[PDB]
Amino acid sequence: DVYAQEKQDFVQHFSQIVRVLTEDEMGHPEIGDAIARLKEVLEYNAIGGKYNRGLTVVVAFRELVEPRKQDADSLQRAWTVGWCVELLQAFFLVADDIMDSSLTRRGQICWYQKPGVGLDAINDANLLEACIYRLLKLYCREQPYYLNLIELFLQSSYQTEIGQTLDLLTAPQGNVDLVRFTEKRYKSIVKYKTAFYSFYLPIAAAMYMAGIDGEKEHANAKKILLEMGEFFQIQDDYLDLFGDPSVTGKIGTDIQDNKCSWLVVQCLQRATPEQYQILKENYGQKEAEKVARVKALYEELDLPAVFLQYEEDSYSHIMALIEQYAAPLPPAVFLGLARKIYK
Amino acid sequence: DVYAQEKQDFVQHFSQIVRVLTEDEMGHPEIGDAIARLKEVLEYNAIGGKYNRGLTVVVAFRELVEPRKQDADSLQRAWTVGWCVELLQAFFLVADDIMDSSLTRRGQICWYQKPGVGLDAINDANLLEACIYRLLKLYCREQPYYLNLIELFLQSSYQTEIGQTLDLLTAPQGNVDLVRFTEKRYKSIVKYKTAFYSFYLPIAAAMYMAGIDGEKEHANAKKILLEMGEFFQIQDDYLDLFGDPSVTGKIGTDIQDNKCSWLVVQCLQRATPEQYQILKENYGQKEAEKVARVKALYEELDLPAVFLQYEEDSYSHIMALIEQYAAPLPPAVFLGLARKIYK
Ligand SMILES: O=C(O)c1ccc2cccc(-c3cccc4ccccc34)c2n1
Ligand SMILES: O=C(O)c1ccc2cccc(-c3cccc4ccccc34)c2n1
Numbered sequence: 078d079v080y081a082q083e084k085q086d087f088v089q090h091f092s093q094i095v096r097v098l099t100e101d102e103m104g105h106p107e108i109g110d111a112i113a114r115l116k117e118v119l120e121y122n123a124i125g126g127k128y129n130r131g132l133t134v135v136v137a138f139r140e141l142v143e144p145r146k147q148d149a150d151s152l153q154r155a156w157t158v159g160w161c162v163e164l165l166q167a168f169f170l171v172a173d174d175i176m177d178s179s180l181t182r183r184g185q186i187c188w189y190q191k192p193g194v195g196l197d198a199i200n201d202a203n204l205l206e207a208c209i210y211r212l213l214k215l216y217c218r219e220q221p222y223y224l225n226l227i228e229l230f231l232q233s234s235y236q237t238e239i240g241q242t243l244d245l246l247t248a249p250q251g252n253v254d255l256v257r258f259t260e261k262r263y264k265s266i267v268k269y270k271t272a273f274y275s276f277y278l279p280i281a282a283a284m285y286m287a288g289i290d291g292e293k294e295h296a297n298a299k300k301i302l303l304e305m306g307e308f309f310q311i312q313d314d315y316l317d318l319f320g321d322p323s324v325t326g327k328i329g330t331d332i333q334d335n336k337c338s339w340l341v342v343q344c345l346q347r348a349t350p351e352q353y354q355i356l357k358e359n360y361g362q363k364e365a366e367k368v369a370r371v372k373a374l375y376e377e378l379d380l381p382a383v384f385l386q387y388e389e390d391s392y393s394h395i396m397a398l399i400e401q402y403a404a405p406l407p408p409a410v411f412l413g414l415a416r417k418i419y420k
Numbered sequence: 421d422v423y424a425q426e427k428q429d430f431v432q433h434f435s436q437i438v439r440v441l442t443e444d445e446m447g448h449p450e451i452g453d454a455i456a457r458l459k460e461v462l463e464y465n466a467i468g469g470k471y472n473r474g475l476t477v478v479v480a481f482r483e484l485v486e487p488r489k490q491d492a493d494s495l496q497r498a499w500t501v502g503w504c505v506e507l508l509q510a511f512f513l514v515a516d517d518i519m520d521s522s523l524t525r526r527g528q529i530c531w532y533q534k535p536g537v538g539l540d541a542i543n544d545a546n547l548l549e550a551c552i553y554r555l556l557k558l559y560c561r562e563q564p565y566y567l568n569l570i571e572l573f574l575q576s577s578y579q580t581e582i583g584q585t586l587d588l589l590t591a592p593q594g595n596v597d598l599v600r601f602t603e604k605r606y607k608s609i610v611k612y613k614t615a616f617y618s619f620y621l622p623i624a625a626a627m628y629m630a631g632i633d634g635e636k637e638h639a640n641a642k643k644i645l646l647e648m649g650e651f652f653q654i655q656d657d658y659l660d661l662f663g664d665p666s667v668t669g670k671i672g673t674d675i676q677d678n679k680c681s682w683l684v685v686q687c688l689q690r691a692t693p694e695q696y697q698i699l700k701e702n703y704g705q706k707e708a709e710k711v712a713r714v715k716a717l718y719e720e721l722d723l724p725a726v727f728l729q730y731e732e733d734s735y736s737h738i739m740a741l742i743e744q745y746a747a748p749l750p751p752a753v754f755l756g757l758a759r760k761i762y763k
Contacts, residue, residue, distance in 0.1 A: 107611075228557070
């Protein structure tokens, strides 16, 4: 598949990305120690994930650009832009793990939790963000899409940041209020916090790199991609609890963390006043006896079945969206990504 | 003076800046609560300072643009860009106060220290940064200097962030090592962390707005401005201890906080091995008996006199720099700013 092959060439490009970002140390020895710290921040935080978002840039680039315009340099730029998406992501996760007091991320200690890092990781996350624009300048300054990419990355950071504001406002630390766990609120969090950067940004970046800079073309791809983003997060919340940890590679803590999950939203929409109380008493607690009780309430309220129906309706929706909005982009741009997302 | 008059028109523009940044709530009600939080972050953090950096943009704009090109809209843009400098600053200070565990800033409780904010202020500081590019897009998208300003703000954020890395590396929390408090290191911290954004950025922004986009013109102004930035921070560190709090409006805590101050750098350059030990034992302690001892060591080593000589040499240097590098900019751009800085 388009991804599994390219993954290697993508990951191998990282070494050049790091060398290039640590190359201003040559002209300015004075900042050497700061650059050594930047190298360490990059190596720790931009590696160890699945690289799918960054890879989507590359895969979409190959599918949107005529093979004769896919020269060595065009490709170096595609991998670089892909890495920029991963750096945007690395910046949000470093910051989010500080904010929600996370202990681990992808099985390793969160960067801020590392001995001698702590709150300095706030500056480290800012550096990761700075690196996107340094890379865009280094690789894409002379390209006609340069400003388009800068604005897309900045807008995507803004939307994610607004998404994080909404999330932090919906589920504060030390605040169990299920009144604000509405469908409308959930959909907005996913849209702003995850969907734009995860789904819209990668395709949109490849689209600009391909000279597809049309407002309607971007609006049409966004329409498709934000729906893909919404399904992806709904599926993630569902798998968090009801998924098998051996397949997902994660053990669900959404209930323990008072997360505004699709599962809680659906439970709240269905639950009788007595069931609302049962949830009020057990949602957000660390105890495995209370974690088992929320799960049993969801199973009682037939949420795995509500998810199954949601999955079917979602699949018809995304196909209706692809048919109506893909053109003039090859439907394979969206289908290849949907296949990776939908099961 | 150029500043004191304009200060009012500058501060009055803030209300429009806030209205404009909270105006996307109209089209997207879904993010309303996040926008309400953004309004509160802006109001708390961008107000209460002296606005000198933002004001420098406006003052330099008036001095670099022919009065016939200073129409209502050109001016709205000057104030907006000035506010962007203040927002860049508000973003660094919110983040820096978290990082160094600050309690107060300009007599008020640090934003993160406010009840119900805490580490969420990391996202708040990111929002403040996002606001610069939203303002540049809203006011300057159709201007020929648009990309030039975006790149200057991004480069200035990067340089400040590198400056902060260097600073955090030089004086870690719970690490009293005077071996790394060298002249060369001090000069680099000031250059990257303070000088670029505080002195180079404001003039450079006005310069681009004036169509002065030449690389040599910017290199020449930078040469002047980074020296102004270096004197400003050396003077600040000196006044922190030896200044009168009734005139400076601040009580010095540099000794208590193990800061890499010009005073410690000079003490270390002069101090005998026994005096090095006296400093090693008393530098970074909260006790007023030990704070009095470091001050007495500096006074013994004749640092107020070393500062006096530095002040005189610095004044001749900045004048030599103005004479050699101002052209073709009116020397008043640099002189008006030097007068505000040098006593
Ligand atoms: O963080 C990752 O890389 C990651 C982690 C877990 C995942 C589980 C299913 C699908 C994807 C996935 C596959 C392909 C493209 C994608 C684009 C955007 C978002 C997700 C994508 C996935 N991605
Ligand atoms: O944070 C502020 O606004 C502030 C606080 C204290 C100060 C003490 C002396 C001079 C300035 C000062 C005056 C004029 C323009 C300036 C431009 C850049 C930096 C400082 C400037 C100063 N500024």
